Amino acid sequence: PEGPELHLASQFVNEACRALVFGGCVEKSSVSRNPEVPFESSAYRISASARGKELRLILSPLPGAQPQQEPLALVFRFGMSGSFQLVPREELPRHAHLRFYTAPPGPRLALCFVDIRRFGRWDLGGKWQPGRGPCVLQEYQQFRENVLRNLADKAFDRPICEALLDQRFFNGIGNYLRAEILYRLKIPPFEKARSVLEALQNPDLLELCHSVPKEVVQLGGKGYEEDFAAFRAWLRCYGMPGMSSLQDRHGRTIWFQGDPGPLAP
DNA sequence: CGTCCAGTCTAC
DNA sequence: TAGACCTGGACGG
């Protein structure tokens, strides 16, 4: 999951939990190495917001809910397989690692953080990860300034295709968006990041870092397959017939058309 | 049956 | 840099 999936997941939680009341404890699977969430309330509401490749749940007790409880924030990173589902309480998916349980009246549900591969993480705190840059979807202008004000960073010595995965400057961009972004501008993936960005300061690379992921958000879906067909059809480069692929320095596969670029293996 | 493939995090 | 962290689906023999 990349910024668009985190964004659609936070919309899911807000739409699906809009008229729900949760109650009780926050149950973690016994196999999860993430922290126990110390929260009980007889009546709480769940909402969400996304920032880049992180999502923030707010647990909000209703007026008069017992025990006495302030709102609690949890920040999630999804790794390669995280997601949220709203399921019937006795029909938990495998790998439902964190669960919030509706109170009565009405059918007993569970909102679950589901993560097959368990690369996902959550922290108690509610703070965004120190060091992640602004959200390419929701903080475009801040995101653009943060890159252009710091081209001196050794990060921008690297190929543009690698620079685009560095969550300090491109919070929300991952492996499919870097391929799709670079292909719209026919920028060789192994051009030096500083060269492509100095030449900045007809949409440019930093505008596409916002508008490309925004296109995925507007497709909708992705558990949030018919909806996965829509995505597959949108892709112009990532995994597509007739496209070249190389490994970057960290063993991640960059898809592209044409010139590999000067800094290539 | 097996191999290979799909975002951090941290020990060298 | 390299390996670690995980599960499961696509494929090859």
Author numbering: 2 to 202, 222 to 244, 250 to 290
Can you list sentences taken from the study reporting this PDB entry?
Human endonuclease VIII-like 1 (hNEIL1) is a bifunctional DNA glycosylase of the Fpg/Nei family, which catalyzes the removal of damaged bases and subsequent incision of the newly generated abasic sites. This mechanism involves two mutually competing interaction states: an activated state that commits catalysis and BER, and a quarantine state that temporarily separates and prevents the flipped base from catalysis via auto-inhibition.
By undergoing a base–acid equilibrium with the adjacent Glu6, K242 can interact with the flipped base as a hydrogen bond acceptor (denoted as “Tau-K2”), forgoing the pre-requisite of the base-tautomerization (“Tau-K1”). Indeed, these two forms of hNEIL1 have been shown to have different glycosylase activities where the unedited hNEIL1(K242) is faster than edited hNEIL1(R242) on several substrates.
